[PDB]
Structure 1
Amino acid sequence: VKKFPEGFLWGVATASYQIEGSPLADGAGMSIWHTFSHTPGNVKNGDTGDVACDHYNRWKEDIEIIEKLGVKAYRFSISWPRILPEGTGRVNQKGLDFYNRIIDTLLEKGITPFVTIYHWDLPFALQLKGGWANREIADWFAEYSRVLFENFGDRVKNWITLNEPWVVAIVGHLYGVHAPGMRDIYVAFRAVHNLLRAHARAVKVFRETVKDGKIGIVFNNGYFEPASEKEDIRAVRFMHQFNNYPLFLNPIYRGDYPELVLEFAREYLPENYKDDMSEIQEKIDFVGLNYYSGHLVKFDPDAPAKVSFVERDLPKTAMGWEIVPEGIYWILKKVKEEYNPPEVYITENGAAFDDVVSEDGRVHDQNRIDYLKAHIGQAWKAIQEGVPLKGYFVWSLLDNFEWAEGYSKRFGIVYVDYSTQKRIVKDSGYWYSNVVKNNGLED
């Protein structure tokens, strides 16, 4: 058996635009994901977050599922444009009311809210003013964060500034695959920098406003392995420093970007970017690591960053993501070893498989059970070796809008039939519930 520490926080996670629907209900402003997904060609099948899981109406049912499963924490995000429809200035009480009801309900039921302040749905009004490219976003983000802290900080005690700021900057502004859909490397690195400045201003405001809570930040991470014994080792070093937590944690803890990020990208950063570093070093309470997959990596002279991925004959999810459970153990060990944060959480881990409802009314997702079990096991290991992991969040409670893939990728432990909005708890949800009840793995 593999038992976790007493009071370890087993959770599930979602994001506002991915589950809520009703993006313009009750005075909400447009988000960049609203305008991006309404632009032909940007999202698979023309899918949008207009309806999604209709969580905007079905929130109570969904929380009742969390409760019935005995899950002890819920990570969810707040839609900035529901709260401040123009990004700054006017506060929409109906946006506040929506999340107030969720928060109060979670607390009544003994579920710990973990709130992600920004999970990618930037107010469109602010994108018109350059969004993450504009230095002034540190101000706008601080003002938004302050509103949240003042309204909810009496009840919510666990906060996350940013979800996956690498993806926000690079996939949003370099690759152009996510909102706002830009392809400019100089804009992408200014977004990296402004994301850090905004994160730090929000933490600063948190300290003035919420005497008792904890605040952190969440990063995407891959387990990069070298294709050979060669510069392949260094291509891995670059991918780690660039794509993983060091891009952001080296500034936060050490006051500068990682060395190989600077070798690649110094020309793209603002000229006097070091001037902002002491403020960026604002103390954080925990690091959230998201983890899904491993990647074989090789030096490649012809690649845009001199690194290409090498396909491996390994089990993959419906995302095409190689299943490499030891990766979650590696990233946990590596974060302690490099930055030694006081607390760590796995804020997302999960898998997309092409789930079907069988004739028995059930979703027999043994592939997802196997995936989760293996990763929970590797996380257990890291704990046994002294990593201060305080919690683990399954992505996702529900099948949802998977960004540019639309509804075609199902990550839930709860199946959503989008034609009726019916929720069907998958085998993996029942399995996970038993994990949480037992506080760990047994066979």
Structure 2
Amino acid sequence: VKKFPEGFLWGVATASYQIEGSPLADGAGMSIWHTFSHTPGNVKNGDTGDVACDHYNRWKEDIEIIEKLGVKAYRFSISWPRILPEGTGRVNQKGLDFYNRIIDTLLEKGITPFVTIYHWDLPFALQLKGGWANREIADWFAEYSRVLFENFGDRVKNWITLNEPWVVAIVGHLYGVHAPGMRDIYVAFRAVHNLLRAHARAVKVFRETVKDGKIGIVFNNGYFEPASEKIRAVRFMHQFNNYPLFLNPIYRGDYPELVLEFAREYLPENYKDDMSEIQEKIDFVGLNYYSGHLVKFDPPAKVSFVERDLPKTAMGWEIVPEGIYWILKKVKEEYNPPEVYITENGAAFDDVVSEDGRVHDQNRIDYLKAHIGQAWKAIQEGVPLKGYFVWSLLDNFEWAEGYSKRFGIVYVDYSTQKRIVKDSGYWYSNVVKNNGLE
């Protein structure tokens, strides 16, 4: 048996644009994912978030699912342009009303809300003004965050400023694969820096507004292993792609060494002037983790991936459970944050509904079990892991892959919007009830 600490938080996670649909309902402004997905060529099969899981209408049902599974926490994100349709200035009460009902329902049902303030759906109005490239977003983001805190801080006590700011910056502004779909390395590194400044301003405002809650920030992480003896390229990928790109500034007041070696020229000339403010104290670190990568030096960023003959998900991501134990050990050893959460872990598989009406995703069960086992290990060795969140409650719009990738522990038939709890969801409910494995 692998039992977790008393009060360990077992949750599931979603993001607004991925599940809600109705992007322009009730006075909402367009987001950059609306405009990006409505641009031909950007998303597989021309898929958009227009309907998604119709959570905008089916939210009560979905929460009743969380309740019925006995899941203890729900991580969800708020659509900035539902709240402030122009990004700043006007506040939309119908947008606040939508999330107020969700929050009150969760609380009524004894489920702990964890709110992600930003999971990628920037108001389009702000993108016209340069979005994450513009220093002024530290102010726009603080004003947005202040509204959320003033309206919801009486009830929501667990907050996340940013989801995966590496993805936002690099995949959105260097690779151009995500909104706003740009390819400029100087813009990408100014977005990294402004994400940090905006994150810190929001925490500063939080201390002024919600004297009783906690706030943190969520990073994507891979487990990079070297293709031989010879490991520095592993060092670069860790410092660039993982929590250190952001935590080195927050805890130590500068970017990591190998990031500055690669990217100094792309950062603002006087970027250190902002570092003292970037060090605003945070309460926890959220780590997302899915995949391991075999890496070797290669004379683009002087790194290339080397395919491995390992079990993979429908994303083509290699399944390396020890990765989640490594990243938890590593974060304690490098920055020693006071709390850590695993804010996303999960897998995409080609799920099918059997003739028996059930989804027999033993592949997803095996994936979740192994990773929860490794998380358990990290705890035994002193990592202050307070919770673990499955990505995702529901199959949903998987960004540039559209609906072709299913991460839910609940199956969604998009022709009907029927939800079918998968075997993995049933399995997870039992883990939560037992507070651990076997």
TM-score (norm 2): 1.00
Partners in 1 of 2:401 and 2:254 — Cα distance?
A: 34
Equivalent in the alignment of 1:87: 87
Aligned-partner Cα distance in 1 for 2:337–2:435 = 24
- What displacement does 1:196 show? 0.0
1:30-79 Cα shifts (integer Å, max 9, x gaps): 00000000000000000000000000000000000000000000000000
1:199, distance to aligned residue in structure 2 (A): 0.0
Partner of 2:254: 256
* Cα distance in 1 for residues equivalent to 2:209 and 2:267: 32
Distance 1:363 1:307 in 2: 39
Shift, 1:101, TM fit: 0.0
Q: How far has the Cα of 1:399 moved from its partner? A: 0.1
CA shift at 1:288, angstroms?
Answer: 0.1
Report what 1:275 is aligned to: 273
CA distance in 1, matches of 2:350, 2:86: 38
How far 1:290 moved relative to its partner? 0.1
- CA drift of 1:85 comes to 0.1
Give, in whole Å, the separation in 2 of the partners of 1:385 and 1:379. 10
Q: CA deviation at 1:103?
A: 0.1
Task: Specify the SS of the correspondent of 2:318.
Answer: coil
Mapped partners of 1:193, 1:88: distance in 2: 21
1:175 shift after superposition: 0.1
1:148 deviates by: 0.1
1:427 corresponds to which of 423, 426, 432: 423
How many Å separate the matches in 2 of 1:97 and 1:56? 12
Task: Give 1:234's aligned residue.
Answer: 232
Q: CA deviation at 1:234?
A: 0.1
* Deviation at residue 294 of structure 1 after TM alignment: 0.1
Deviations 1:215-254 (A, max 9, x none): 0000000000000001xx0000000000000000000000
Deviation, structure 1 residue 185? 0.1
Aligned-residue offset at 1:299: 0.2
For the residue of structure 1 that corresponds to 2:188, the secondary structure is helix
Q: CA deviation at 1:166?
A: 0.1
Shift of 1:324: 0.1
Report how far residue 389 of structure 1 moved: 0.1
Cα offset, 1:375, TM superposition? 0.1
SS at match of 2:290: strand
Equivalent position SS for 1:371? helix
Q: Using the alignment, how far apart are the partners of 1:290 and 1:76 within structure 2? A: 14
> How far, CA to CA, are the matches of 1:48 and 1:377 in structure 2?
36
2:404 corresponds to 1:408: yes
Report how far residue 88 of structure 1 moved: 0.0
Distance in 1 between residues matched to 2:390 and 2:400, nearest whole Å: 21
- 1:371-421 CA-partner distances (Å, limit 9, x unpaired): 000000000000000000000000000000000000000000000000000
SS in structure 2 at match of 1:96: helix
Identity %: 100
Distance 2:219 2:413 in 1: 30
Counterpart secondary structure, 2:311: coil
Deviation at 1:122, TM superposition (A): 0.0
Partner SS for 1:216: strand
Deviations 1:155-189 (A, max 9, x none): 00000000000000000000000000000000000
- What is the aligned partner in structure 2 of residue 112 from structure 1? 112
Quick one: distance in 2 between partners of 1:58 and 1:371?
A: 28
Q: Describe the superposition over 1:316-373 as per-residue Cα deviations: whole angstroms up to 9, x where unpaired.
A: 0000000000000000000000000000000000000000000000000000000000
Structure 2: distance between partners of 1:346 and 1:336: 13
Shift of 1:135: 0.1
Distance in 1 of aligned mates of 2:29 and 2:406: 28
- C-alpha distance in structure 2 between counterparts of 1:204 and 1:189, whole Å: 23
Secondary structure of residue in 1 paired with 2:317: coil
SS at match of 2:367: helix
Q: Hey, what does 2:310 align to over in structure 1?
A: 314
Per-residue Cα deviation, 1:82-130 (whole angstroms, up to 9, x for no partner): 0000000000000000000000000000000000000000000000000
> Residues of 2 paired with 1:398 and 1:238: CA distance?
34
Question: What are structure 1's unaligned runs of at least 5 residues?
Answer: none
SS at match of 1:399: coil
Q: In structure 2, what is the equivalent of residue 418 of structure 1?
A: 414
For residues 109 and 363 of structure 1, the distance between their equivalents in structure 2, rounded to whole angstroms, comes to 27
For residues 354 and 109 of structure 2, the distance between their equivalents in structure 1, rounded to whole angstroms, comes to 32
Which residue of 1 is the match for residue 161 of structure 2?
Answer: 161
Structure 1 residue 80, shift from structure 2 partner: 0.1
Distance 1:216 1:403 in 2: 24
Match of 1:437, SS?
helix
Describe the SS at the equivalent of 1:346: strand
- Aligned equivalents of 1:253, 1:211: Cα separation in 2: 22
The CA deviation at 1:191 is: 0.1
SS in 2 for 1:6: coil
In the TM superposition, what whole-angstrom CA distance separates every residue of 1:275-300 from its partner, at most 9, and x where no partner exists? 00000000000000000000000000
The 1-side partners of 2:376 and 2:45 are apart by 39
SS at match of 2:181: coil
Paired residue secondary structure (1:53): coil
Deviation at 1:137, TM superposition (A): 0.1
Q: Which runs of 4+ in 1 moved over 3 A?
A: none
Tell me if 1:132 matches 2:132.
yes
* Inter-partner Cα distance in structure 2 for 1:178 and 1:414: 25
Cα RMSD for the two superposed structures = 0.1
Three-state SS of the structure 2 residue aligned to 1:76 is strand
TM-score, scaled to structure 1: 0.99
Q: Secondary structure at the match of 1:172?
A: helix
Give 3-state SS (helix, strand or coil) of 2:102's partner. helix
